[PDB]
Amino acid sequence: SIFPTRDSRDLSSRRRSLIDWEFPQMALVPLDQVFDWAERSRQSLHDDIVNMHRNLFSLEPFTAMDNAFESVMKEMSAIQPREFHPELEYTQPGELDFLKDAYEVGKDGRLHFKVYFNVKNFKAEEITIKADKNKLVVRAQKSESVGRSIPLPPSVDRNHIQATITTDDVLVIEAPVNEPNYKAIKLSPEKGLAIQPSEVQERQLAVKNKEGLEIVTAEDGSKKIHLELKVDPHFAPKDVKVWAKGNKVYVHGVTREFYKAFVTPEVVDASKTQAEIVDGLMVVEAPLFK
Amino acid sequence: SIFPTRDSRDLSSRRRSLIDWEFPQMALVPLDQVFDWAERSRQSLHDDIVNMHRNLFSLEPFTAMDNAFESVMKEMSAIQPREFHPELEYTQPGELDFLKDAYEVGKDGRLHFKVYFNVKNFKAEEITIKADKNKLVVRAQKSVACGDAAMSESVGRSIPLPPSVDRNHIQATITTDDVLVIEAPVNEPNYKAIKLSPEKGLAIQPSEVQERQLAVKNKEGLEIVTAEDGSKKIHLELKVDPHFAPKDVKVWAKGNKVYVHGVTGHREFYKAFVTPEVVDASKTQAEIVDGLMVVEAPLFK
Numbered sequence: 001s002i003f004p005t006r007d008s009r010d011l012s013s014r015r016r017s018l019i020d021w022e023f024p025q026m027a028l029v030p031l032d033q034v035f036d037w038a039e040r041s042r043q044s045l046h047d048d049i050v051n052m053h054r055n056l057f058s059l060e061p062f063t064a065m066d067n068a069f070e071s072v073m074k075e076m077s078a079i080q081p082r083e084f085h086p087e088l089e090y091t092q093p094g095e096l097d098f099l100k101d102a103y104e105v106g107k108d109g110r111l112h113f114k115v116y117f118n119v120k121n122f123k124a125e126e127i128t129i130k131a132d133k134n135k136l137v138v139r140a141q142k143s144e145s146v147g148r149s150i151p152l153p154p155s156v157d158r159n160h161i162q163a164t165i166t167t168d169d170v171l172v173i174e175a176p177v178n179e180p181n182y183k184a185i186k187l188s189p190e191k192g193l194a195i196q197p198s199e200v201q202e203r204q205l206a207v208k209n210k211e212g213l214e215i216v217t218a219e220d221g222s223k224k225i226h227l228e229l230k231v232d233p234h235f236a237p238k239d240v241k242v243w244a245k246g247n248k249v250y251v252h253g254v255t256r257e258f259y260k261a262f263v264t265p266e267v268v269d270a271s272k273t274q275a276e277i278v279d280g281l282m283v284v285e286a287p288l289f290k
Numbered sequence: 291s292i293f294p295t296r297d298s299r300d301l302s303s304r305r306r307s308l309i310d311w312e313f314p315q316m317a318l319v320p321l322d323q324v325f326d327w328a329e330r331s332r333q334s335l336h337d338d339i340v341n342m343h344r345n346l347f348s349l350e351p352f353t354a355m356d357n358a359f360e361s362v363m364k365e366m367s368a369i370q371p372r373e374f375h376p377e378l379e380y381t382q383p384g385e386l387d388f389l390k391d392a393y394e395v396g397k398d399g400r401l402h403f404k405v406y407f408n409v410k411n412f413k414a415e416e417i418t419i420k421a422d423k424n425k426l427v428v429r430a431q432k433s434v435a436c437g438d439a440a441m442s443e444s445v446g447r448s449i450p451l452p453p454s455v456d457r458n459h460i461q462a463t464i465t466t467d468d469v470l471v472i473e474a475p476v477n478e479p480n481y482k483a484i485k486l487s488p489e490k491g492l493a494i495q496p497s498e499v500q501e502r503q504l505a506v507k508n509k510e511g512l513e514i515v516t517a518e519d520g521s522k523k524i525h526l527e528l529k530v531d532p533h534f535a536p537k538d539v540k541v542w543a544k545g546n547k548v549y550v551h552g553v554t555g556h557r558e559f560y561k562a563f564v565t566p567e568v569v570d571a572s573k574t575q576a577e578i579v580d581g582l583m584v585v586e587a588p589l590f591k
Contacts, residue, residue, distance in 0.1 A: 001420035004462035004470055011406075011469050012339045019331045024399040025318045031482060032320065034313050041309045049302040109314040124294045163294035166301045171294055183321055 028109035029185060037105065037187045056118035056170060059146040062139060069135075069149040072096075076247055077290060079265040081213050081225075086250055086261035096151060096246030096267060100192035103177070103271060110176045111185065111271055113156040117148060117171035124165055129173065131158050134267075134289050138171065153269040154222075154289050155180065180271030186241060191250075194243035197275035197282055199236075205276050205283045213262045218287060225249060225264055227284040231277065232256055242275050242284050244268035249286065266290045318399035319484060327395060327486050334488075345388075346408035346469060349430050349445035359425075359448045366546055367591060369566040371512055371524075376549060376562035386450060386545030386568060390491035393476070393572060400475045401484065401492075401572055403455045407447060409470040419462050419472060424590055426451040426472065452570040453590050454479060479572030485540060490549070493542040496576030496583055498535075504577055504584040512548075512563040514589065524548060524565055526585040530578060531557060541576050541585050543569040548587070567591045 007014060025031075041048070059065075072095050084090065098115075106112040115136070119127060122140045130137045131152055139147040161175040184195040207228065208214070214226040231240075231253055240253040247267050251260040266288035273286035297304070315321070331338070349355075362385050374380060388405070396402040407428060409417065417430045429446035433439070460474040485493040506527065507513070513525045530539070530552060538554040546568050550561045567589040574587040 001418045002460065002462060004414045004417055004419065004464045004472075006414050007463050007465045009465065010467040011342060011465050011471075012335065014465060014471075015339065016332070016335060018395075018397065019328045019335065021328075021397050023318075023324050023395065023397070025315050025321045025324060028313075028315045028318075028321070030321045031315045031318070034315060035482060038309050038311075038313075042306075045302070045306060045309065049305065052301065052305075105308075105313070107308060107311050107313070124296050127294055129292050129294065161292060163292060164297040165294050166297050166299060166304065168300040170301045172297075172301075172304075173294075183325060 026182065029105045029111055029182065029187070033185060033187045034105055034109070040189065052116060053168075053170070056116050057138075057148050057150070058118050059122075059138065059140055059148050062145040062147040065147055066137075066149050073151075073290060076267075077265045079247070079263060081215055081262070081264045083213055083260065083262050086252075086259050090245075090248060090261075090263065094246050094248075099151065099153075099267065099270070100243070100245050103187075103193045105187075106174070106176065108176070111180045111182070112174050112176050113153065114172065114174040115150065117173070118169065119165055119171045120169040122169075127165075127171065129161070129163055131161060136173065138173070151267050151289075153177075153267070153271075154287065155269050155272055177271050181274055184273075184275070185271070188241075191241065191243040193270055194241040195270075195273045195275060197237050197240050197242065197277040197284070199278050200276050201278075203276055203278065203283070205274060205285050207281065207283055213264070215264060215288070223266060223288040225262070225268065225284070225286050225288055227251070227262065227282075229260060229282045229284075230280060231258060231282055233280040235277070237277060240275075240277060240282070242273060244270040244273070244286070249284070251282075251284065264288060316481065317478075318481065319395045319401055319486075320481065323484060323486050324395055324399070330488070342406060343469070346406050347388075347447050347449070348408050349412075349428065349447050352429060352444040352446040355446055356448055363450075363591060366568075367566050369546065369564060371514055371563065371565045373512060373561060373563050376560050380547060380562075380564060384545050384547075389450065389452075389568070389571070390542070390544040393486075393492040395486075396473065396475060398475070401479045401481070402473050402475050403452065404471065404473045405449060407470040407472070408468065409464060410468040412468075414464045417462075417464070417470065419460065421451060421457050421460065424451050424453060425449065428470070428472070450568050450590075452476075452568070452572070453588065454570050454573050476572050480574055483574075483576070484572070490540060490542040491544075492571050493540045494571075494574040494576050494585075496536050496539055496541065496578040496585070498579055499577050500579075502577060502579060502584070504575060504586050506582065506584060512565070514565060514567075515586075522567060522589040524563070524569065524585070524587050524589055526550070526563065526583075528561065528583045528585075529581050530559070530583050532581055533557060534578070536578055539576075539578060539583065541574060543571040543574070543587065545569070548585070550583075550585070565589060 127140045136152040186194045218224045235253045239255040249262045269287040275284040431444045483494045539552040570588040576585045
């Protein structure tokens, strides 16, 4: 048997404390997604492993490799933001397209950024890893250093980056993502990480009567894309998915069907994307980084 | 500038381990469900609190109250399981109907069993709480006067306590406005299928699976299946029109009664069944694959 304890608040207030509480699952990938992901992942386990090894980032002559990376970023920043036919333009795989598949749930249930490097013939002591601004750098030294530099979205937690080399020589680098849009996340094999718009009563994303792509300035100087699309009212939230492929944003609805796409001069921080479709007008916003 | 550590596993071993992992959220109420709950809960906090106070369990002369409880459970055990019209029969409030709303998310994100008791005129130290078999027992008792050992007659209240509720983690708290709150998490409820709503309380949404996990005894209707060990569960089979998608059907309990509702587009149906024992609702399972829905839920007395 046991004895109760006195509280300090009435019923009402104790129930209010519960109502406004920060439940753990609000900071974890939704159960349905994790379940579906786990299910299909074991069915393709053997092939996915084979493909992972087949697509490991290789380490190349550092200096040359790093400049090539800088020119890519530099060139990209010269793109003029515009809309394009998703099925006709940019159909060729792009340099930053791997970011689409860099997100995966971790054992802690949170969303994580994970990338894989081939480090065969190198020892852990010969490998350094740095995160400066929005680029991750892997450098190995035996004669000159070899390495790899890649975009590292701002949302990836720099204080919790982990790095281990498997027995089959795969450098794994991962870190959780801070504050991704958990409620809207959809994990799919194709799109990788997409978000589903929410039907709201009170919009949280400012409408601006500007139909199309815009690129504004977040509440702190940084940039972010703003899209306004007029879509048939016969489209429900569950019929629409927004996703990113490097510096490109794709929107696809099917119930009736549409497919839009936009290229920008910066990389899209996908897991932080937000979309609210209501009254035939869907507005998408997502942070951008370079 | 960090340096990597060498692991003891190969890549595929690590992956297989992640895939079969027991993710935290697989033991928590689904995010959307919690979100929607809190959303509408604040929208109706006032009224909800009114009704709660108006429906608090009271403590009564212990011996009498306990006899009454055994009586009610005895009468119930004599019920002949059968289907009944959900809108025209068992329309009056029942003794175990509170169970439909005893389920609620807790701060730890798990599904909890929560019951409230009016405990005015009692100090937290005068109240005792214990779990005996499948019943929750609350007993209070105060002295008659200061300086004398004599006690007043014990008052109390006993209620059905589903087997799934965790006996080792019961917590009891008395508010400032005299409402004894008793909570406890539920062990392994059907988290993925849970649908919370004020009207149905805790409902289950059947799943469309390729591999039927529940048995098909090829016979429509309700059936009380008894296992070698003595355990009992309800097994319900229903042929439903193919136009009904899993998301169009909901199953839920109200004490010793089970309700099934389906509506799509435009067609709908509404069936109900009464049993001689209490349903352990959160443990309910339902799968509807190609016209045949099967529902199984543990029974208990």
